[PDB]
Amino acid sequence: MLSPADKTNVKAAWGKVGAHAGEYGAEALERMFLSFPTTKTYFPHFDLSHGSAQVKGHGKKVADALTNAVAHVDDMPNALSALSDLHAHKLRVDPVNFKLLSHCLLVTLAAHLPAEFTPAVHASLDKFLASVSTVLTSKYR
Amino acid sequence: MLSPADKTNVKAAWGKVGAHAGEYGAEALERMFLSFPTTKTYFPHFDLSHGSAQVKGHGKKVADALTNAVAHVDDMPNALSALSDLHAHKLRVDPVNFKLLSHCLLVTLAAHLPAEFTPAVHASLDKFLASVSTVLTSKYR
Amino acid sequence: VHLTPEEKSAVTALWGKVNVDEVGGEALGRLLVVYPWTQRFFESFGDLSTPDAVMGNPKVKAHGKKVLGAFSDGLAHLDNLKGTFATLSELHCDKLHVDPENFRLLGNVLVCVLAHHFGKEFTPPVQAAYQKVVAGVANALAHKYH
Amino acid sequence: VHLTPEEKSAVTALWGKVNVDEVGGEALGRLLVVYPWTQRFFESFGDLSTPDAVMGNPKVKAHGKKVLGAFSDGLAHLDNLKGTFATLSELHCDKLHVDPENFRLLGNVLVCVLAHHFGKEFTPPVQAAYQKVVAGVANALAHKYH
Ligand code: HEM
Ligand code: HEM
Ligand code: HEM
Ligand code: HEM
Numbered sequence: 109m110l111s112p113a114d115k116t117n118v119k120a121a122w123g124k125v126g127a128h129a130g131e132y133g134a135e136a137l138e139r140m141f142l143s144f145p146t147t148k149t150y151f152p153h154f155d156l157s158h159g160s161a162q163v164k165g166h167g168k169k170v171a172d173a174l175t176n177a178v179a180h181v182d183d184m185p186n187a188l189s190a191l192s193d194l195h196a197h198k199l200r201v202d203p204v205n206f207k208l209l210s211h212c213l214l215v216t217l218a219a220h221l222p223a224e225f226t227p228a229v230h231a232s233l234d235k236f237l238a239s240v241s242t243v244l245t246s247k248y249r
Numbered sequence: 250m251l252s253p254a255d256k257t258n259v260k261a262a263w264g265k266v267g268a269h270a271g272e273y274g275a276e277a278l279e280r281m282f283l284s285f286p287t288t289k290t291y292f293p294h295f296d297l298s299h300g301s302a303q304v305k306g307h308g309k310k311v312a313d314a315l316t317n318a319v320a321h322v323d324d325m326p327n328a329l330s331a332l333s334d335l336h337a338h339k340l341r342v343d344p345v346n347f348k349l350l351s352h353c354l355l356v357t358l359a360a361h362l363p364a365e366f367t368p369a370v371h372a373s374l375d376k377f378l379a380s381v382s383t384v385l386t387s388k389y390r
Numbered sequence: 391v392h393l394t395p396e397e398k399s400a401v402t403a404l405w406g407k408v409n410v411d412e413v414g415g416e417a418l419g420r421l422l423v424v425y426p427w428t429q430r431f432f433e434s435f436g437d438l439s440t441p442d443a444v445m446g447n448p449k450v451k452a453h454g455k456k457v458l459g460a461f462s463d464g465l466a467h468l469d470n471l472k473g474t475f476a477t478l479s480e481l482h483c484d485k486l487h488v489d490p491e492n493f494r495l496l497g498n499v500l501v502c503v504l505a506h507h508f509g510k511e512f513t514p515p516v517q518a519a520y521q522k523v524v525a526g527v528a529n530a531l532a533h534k535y536h
Numbered sequence: 537v538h539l540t541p542e543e544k545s546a547v548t549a550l551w552g553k554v555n556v557d558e559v560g561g562e563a564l565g566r567l568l569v570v571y572p573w574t575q576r577f578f579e580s581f582g583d584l585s586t587p588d589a590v591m592g593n594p595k596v597k598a599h600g601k602k603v604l605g606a607f608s609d610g611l612a613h614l615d616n617l618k619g620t621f622a623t624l625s626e627l628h629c630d631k632l633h634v635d636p637e638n639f640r641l642l643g644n645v646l647v648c649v650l651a652h653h654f655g656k657e658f659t660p661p662v663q664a665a666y667q668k669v670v671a672g673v674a675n676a677l678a679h680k681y682h
Contacts, residue, residue, distance in 0.1 A: 109387060135660070142664040145536055149487045200427035202491045211644055215663060218651035225652050227569040228587045234570055235390060246250065249376060249426055276514070283518035287681055290633040299514075341573035343637040352498055356517060359505035366506050368423040369441045375424055390572050 110235055115181050117232035121217065121224050122178045129175055132216050134167025139212040147205055174213075177240050184243045196247035203248065206241035213237060251376060256322050258373035262358065263319045265365050270316055273357050275308025280353040288346055315354075318381050325384045337388040344386045351378035391468055391526040397519035398468065404508065404516060405465055413503055414458030415451035419444050421492075421499045428492055457496075464527055471530035479534035490532035497524030537614055537672035543665040544614060550654065550662060551611055559649055560604030561597035565590050567638075567645045574638055603642075610673060617676035625680035636678035643670030 110118075125132060140147050141156055154162045173191060180187035195201055214233060218225050251259075266273055281288050282297050282304075295303045314332060321328035336342055355374060359366045393401065421428050423441045432438065435449040444450060460478060467474040482488045501520055505512040539547065568575050569587045578584065581595035590596060606624065613620040628634045647666055651658045 139660045139663055142660045143667040146490055146532070149483070149489045149535075152487045196427075200430035202427060202489050204491050205489070211647075214648055215651045215658075218648045219655055219658055222652065222655060226587070227566050227591055230566060230648065231390070231570045231587070249250075249372070249424075280514045280517055283514045284521040287635055287637070287678070290629070290635045290681075293633045337573070341576040343573060343635050345637050346635070352501075355502055356505045356512075359502050360509050360512055363506060363509060367441070368420050368445055371420060371502065372424045372441070390570075 110181065110232075110239060113228075114232040114235055117229045118178055118181065118236045121221060121229050121233060122175070124221055124224055125171075125217070128220070129171035130164070130168035132167075132213075132220060133169075133171035133174075134164045136209065136213040136216040137163055137167050137170070139215055140209050143212065144208045147208055150199070150201055150205070174240065177243075178236075181236075184239060185246070188240070188243050192244055192247050195244050203241075203245045206244060210234070210237035210241055251322065251373075251380060254369075255373040255376055258370045259319055259322065259377045262362065262365050262370050262374060263316070265362055266312075266358070269361070270312035271305070271309035273308075273354075273361060274310075274312030274315070275305045277350065277353040277357045278304050278308050278311070280356055281350050284353065285346075285349045288349055291340070291342055291346070311350075315381065318377075318384075322377075325380065326387070329381070329384050333385055333388045336385050341389075344382075344389065347382035347385060351375070351382060354378060391471065391522050393468065393519060393522060396515075397522065400516045400519045401465065401468075401523055404504065404511070404520075405462070407508075408504075410458045410462055411451075411455045413500075413507065414454035414456070416445075416454070416507075417496065417500045417503045418454035418457060419447070419450050420503060421496050422450065424499060425495050428495065431486070431488060431492075461500075461527060464530065465523070468523070468526075471526050472533050475527070475530040476534060479531050482531060483535045490528065490535060493528035493531045494525075497521075497528050500524060537617065537668055539614060539665060539668060543668070546662045546665045547611065547614075547669055550650070550657070550666075551608070553654075554608075554650075556604050556608050557597075557601045559646075559653065560600035560602075562591075562600070563642065563646045563649045564600030564603060565593070565596050566649060567642050568596065570645060571641050574641065577632070577634065607646075607673060610676075611669070614669070614672075617672050618679050621673065621676040622680060625677050628677060629681045636674065636681060639674035639677050640671075643674050646670060 122129075138158065141151075148156060154160065154166070156163065173188065176187055177184050185192075214230070214237065217233060218230070263270075279299065282292075289297060292307075295301065295307070297304065314329065317328055318325055326333075355371065355378070358374060359371070422432070422438055422444045429438050432450075432453075435453075436447050437443040438447065438450075464471055464474050472479075482490075501517060501524065504520065505517070568578070568584060568590050575584050578596070578599070581593055581599070583589045583593065584596075610617060610620050628636075647663065647670060650666065651663070
């Protein structure tokens with residue numbers, strides 16, 4: 109459960125990401141495909157080569173979604189409703205994979221936010237990513 | 250997300266457990282310790298031998314908690330509040346372990362309720378144990 | 391896998407009583423019911439909308455029989471699961487695009503099905519032997535992923 | 537572990553730039569902050585009341601140096617981790633009662649610490665190589681559990 113301090117930490121860190129949200133989104137995906145190759149099973153229709161427009165565009169859509177969730181951190185369920193339905197009913201990504209992308213998104217933020225990535229912010233971001241993952245998989249069954 | 254049919258399925262299955270709930274709880278633990286030996290790390294103070302009274306005693310405590318969860322299936326967070334505090338702040342059992350016990354409880358139910366363990370009931374029970382697990386780990390951080 | 395002589399005998403003795411056709415169909419149908427996201431690999435199988443629909447689907451029963459049949463073969467080569475499943479590992483990765491986590495879910499549903507079928511004979515020690523086997527098989531099938 | 541020659545050199549090259557004692561204290565403190573249930577083994581360490589208290593605790597830092605020093609020595613034996621960590625595996629299971637999941641948590645926290653430390657030098661391919669190592673060490677430490 110996100111405390112108020114958690115919400116403040118996320119907002120602060122995400123704020124700093126700012127304009128690079130899409131570029132970070134793309135790098136996190138590339139880190140995931142390389143570290144955890146089994147995730148590639150869900151992208152057989154993509155050119156997964158480094159800097160592909162498909163990954164860059166997907167990275168952007170992922171970042172925008174995270175931005176929407178930070179914006180509406182007090183009501184994520186409603187905010188990500190549509191995404192929650194798409195993943196549950198169409199994409200059908202095994203829930204384990206959400207933890208692997210969350211890990212790679214945390215590594216990307218760490219690599220880019222030297223000042224802001226303190227232990228307390230790291231904890232808050234981890235929890236935030238876990239909440240987003242829970243909302244995304246909440247309509248699976 | 251427990252639907253009215255899930256709730257119905259759980260109350261029915263648990264209904265049939267009836268008085269054996271404690272013996273099934275002990276058997277589930279025994280299956281867990283044998284199948285997933287890392288779970289033994291939380292009970293260094295128990296005699297884990299077959300027939301151990303300590304395992305039998307603990308099995309009854311677990312089964313009783315589940316009985317209470319079934320009874321309050323609409324208000325689980327409040328009903329298991331004290332157990333969430335306990336696990337989060339004292340026992341500090343890694344969240345991964347909850348899935349292993351849930352699996353062993355399912356195997357126990359299967360082995361004892363031939364007739365009642367239909368595919369629909371199996372799905373409802375899995376969802377119910379995942380909900381109990383979520384509640385139990387909700388205050389970890 | 392490393393099974394004690396007692397685990398190997400437990401495994402083998404129970405498997406001689408398994409009707410692979412029947413257990414195969416039950417295991418695959420229960421996977422599709424309990425973890426419905428797994429239906430994503432079976433769009434051409436027909437009606438998978440309800441438990442009853444899933445369980446009486448002949449394409450499900452047929453596939454279930456194929457899968458458990460291949461699983462039976464690894465039981466004969468418990469000392470060389472990776473070598474036994476190499477070709478099938480590459481198929482599932484390169485052609486089928488199946489996330490290996492699905493192998494783990496099926497292993498757990500199978501355990502449930504043997505317990506349901508066998509009752510009291512599926513004792514804690516027997517289960518433990520089976521759990522090592524289904525993990526072994528899952529690992530053997532994910533081995534050639536890249 | 538099976539790392540390509542390229543992978544081994546990427547690991548070794550970055551490691552050469554690490555202050556073991558510093559990263560050790562940071563990784564251990566961050567494990568205790570991010571996954572607080574891990575504090576269960578450390579009640580004798582004193583005050584773990586806040587992030588600041590954890591990160592500043594001399595007992596945490598000393599334990600982090602001990603853990604990473606062993607880790608560091610294992611990087612010399614990439615080819616024989618199971619053998620290298622066998623006695624420690626036994627110790628962690630039989631005397632310490634540490635659930636091996638803690639090893640996996642520490643490995644992810646270590647990767648985030650390296651990323652934070654190295655920034656852009658911690659590229660996707662260097663991360664992948666470290667992921668294999670951290671999984672390898674976790675597995676080697678869990679190997680003798682029974
Ligand atoms: C933080 C977690 C995640 C978020 C916020 C997220 C968000 C999104 C968004 C915004 C889209 C595009 C929807 C559209 O185009 O209308 C999408 C599609 C998709 N996602 Fe998720 N996703 C997440 C996790 C995952 C994971 C872990 C995987 C698999 C490893 C995955 C696989 C997919 C796939 C395959 C698509 C469709 C790609 C395409 O054909 O364009 N997602 N996701
Ligand atoms: C369905 C999930 C679970 C339920 C309903 C449950 C319930 C309980 C209950 C009712 C108690 C007794 C509290 C007391 O002493 O008043 C307890 C204690 C305990 N539980 Fe949990 N538990 C669950 C999962 C787990 C798991 C997965 C583990 C570890 C593998 C675990 C480890 C323990 C330990 C070590 C104790 C203390 C035992 C003692 O010293 O008497 N629990 N649990
Ligand atoms: C015990 C683990 C498994 C074994 C031994 C196994 C074995 C097999 C075999 C022998 C085939 C037939 C290949 C052919 O002749 O085309 C096959 C195909 C297939 N398997 Fe696996 N399987 C396993 C688990 C799974 C799981 C868990 C899934 C997904 C939930 C899956 C999805 C498929 C699909 C989609 C096909 C192709 C069916 C078709 O041709 O439409 N398998 N498998
Ligand atoms: C890379 C993973 C790890 C390595 C290489 C490692 C290594 C070590 C070493 C070398 C020791 C001292 C052994 C001795 O006393 O001779 C030790 C002790 C210990 N470790 Fe581990 N460790 C690791 C992870 C962990 C984790 C994640 C935890 C718990 C969250 C943990 C808990 C402990 C405890 C409680 C002790 C005893 C400390 C004492 O008695 O002062 N270790 N470890």
